Each structure stands twice: as structure tokens, then as C-alpha cells.
């Protein structure tokens, strides 16, 4: 009956070649844990650790091995063909590089929005002629507003975003933004 939990390691956003592990946890004991893609005929079968913990090892993933995965569990007792409520879809992204963000000045301090289209990324902002990152924050939301002080603000700037932990996936650097005097 009630739906299980499906999570991924070491991250839900990975570069290609990374070994991914899907872990499904049932809120009650089960015999089988099916992995459900959209586009597949029959589900694929997790490997049981316990009656409430199963694992699916994704060996050295590829881009097409990304998409929307769901987990359902079942007992033989329920009868043929019937599964639990499907787990929330775990969205797995496999890319070598992430879509580049935009860097823009927003509507005397000055704020700069580096914006991508992906959540839970770390956003970094660079000034030209300055090696180390100027600023960076983690953002749940797919954008980061960097505030600059008016009197040290003019200069050239770029940004990129990236996942928070290794194995890193990095966005292509954004186009350059110039702040004039």
C-alpha cells in the first residue's frame, strides 16, 4: 500500500561514468522492489538488503540512463501484478557539463543575478583580473544575487554554477558582463 522512498548516491546530478546507487526504503516490509522508468515494458528489480531496504546499482552511468525513476515494492501475498503506491520520482541528471547561466544586472550598490535553470546549485562569480572567486553562495533556488559596492563595482564579470559535492558537474561559464563607469 503506502509508497516507498527512493534516493540516489553520490548525487542526483552526476557526470557520465559515475557509479550511481539507488536505494529504496519501504515504510513496511516487502519482498520485491521494482524500479520504474517511463518507457520501459516491465520494471527492473532492486537487490534486497532487508525487507525494507533494496538497492539498484547503476554501473558507470550514461546520459540516457538519466530520467525519472520510481520505486514500487510488493509482497507475493498481494497477488500477481499488484505493487505499492509508486515512490516520488527521483530525477537523475547525467551530463558532462551543465547549461550555462545568465549573468545580468537587476532592476548606489549593484546586484548581479547569475541564473540557471537548475535548483540546489552553488553559484560563483568572477571578476576579470582577479583569480579567486569574488563571491559564492549555495542556492536552493536556481539563481544567486550577488551585490557589489558601487565604488569597486565597475569591471568585467562572469559566473558559473555547479553541484555542491564531488563528483562535480559544472555549468559552462556564462557570457561576460561589463559594468561601466
Amino acid at each position: 500500500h503506502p509508497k516507498p522512498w527512493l534516493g540516489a548516491q553520490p548525487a542526483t546530478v552526476v557526470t557520465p561514468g559515475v557509479n550511481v546507487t539507488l536505494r529504496c526504503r519501504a515504510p513496511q516490509p516487502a519482498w520485491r522492489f521494482g524500479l520504474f522508468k517511463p518507457g520501459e515494458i516491465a520494471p527492473l528489480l532492486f537487490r534486497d538488503v532487508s525487507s525494507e531496504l533494496a538497492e539498484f546499482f547503476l554501473e558507470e552511468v550514461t546520459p540516457a540512463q538519466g530520467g525519472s525513476y520510481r520505486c514500487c515494492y510488493r509482497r507475493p501475498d498481494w497477488g500477481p501484478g499488484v505493487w505499492s503506491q509508486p515512490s516520488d520520482v527521483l530525477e537523475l541528471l547525467v551530463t558532462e557539463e551543465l547549461p550555462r547561466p545568465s549573468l545580468v544586472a537587476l532592476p548606489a550598490n549593484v546586484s548581479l543575478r547569475c541564473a540557471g535553470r537548475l535548483r540546489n546549485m552553488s553559484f560563483v562569480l568572477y571578476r576579470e583580473g582577479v583569480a579567486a572567486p569574488l563571491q559564492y553562495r549555495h542556492s536552493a533556488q536556481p539563481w544567486a544575487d550577488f551585490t557589489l559596492l558601487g565604488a569597486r563595482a565597475p569591471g568585467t564579470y562572469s559566473c558559473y554554477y555547479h553541484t555542491p559535492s564531488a563528483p562535480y558537474v559544472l555549468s559552462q561559464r556564462s557570457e561576460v558582463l561589463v559594468i561601466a563607469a
Binding site: 560563483v124 568572477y126 559566473c159 559535492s165 564531488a166 561559464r173 561576460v176
Partner: peptide
């Protein structure tokens, strides 16, 4: 606790200078 893991590579550099 042990030291943290290394940061990620930075992004591609800024574009070169206008030449000839």
C-alpha cells in the same frame, strides 16, 4: 573531523585581448 575535500575546478577564463 577531517579536512574537507577539494573545491571544483573554476570556469573557463575570460576571453583574450583584441589583437591586430
Amino acid at each position: 573531523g577531517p579536512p574537507g575535500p577539494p573545491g571544483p575546478p573554476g570556469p573557463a577564463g575570460f576571453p583574450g585581448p583584441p589583437g591586430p
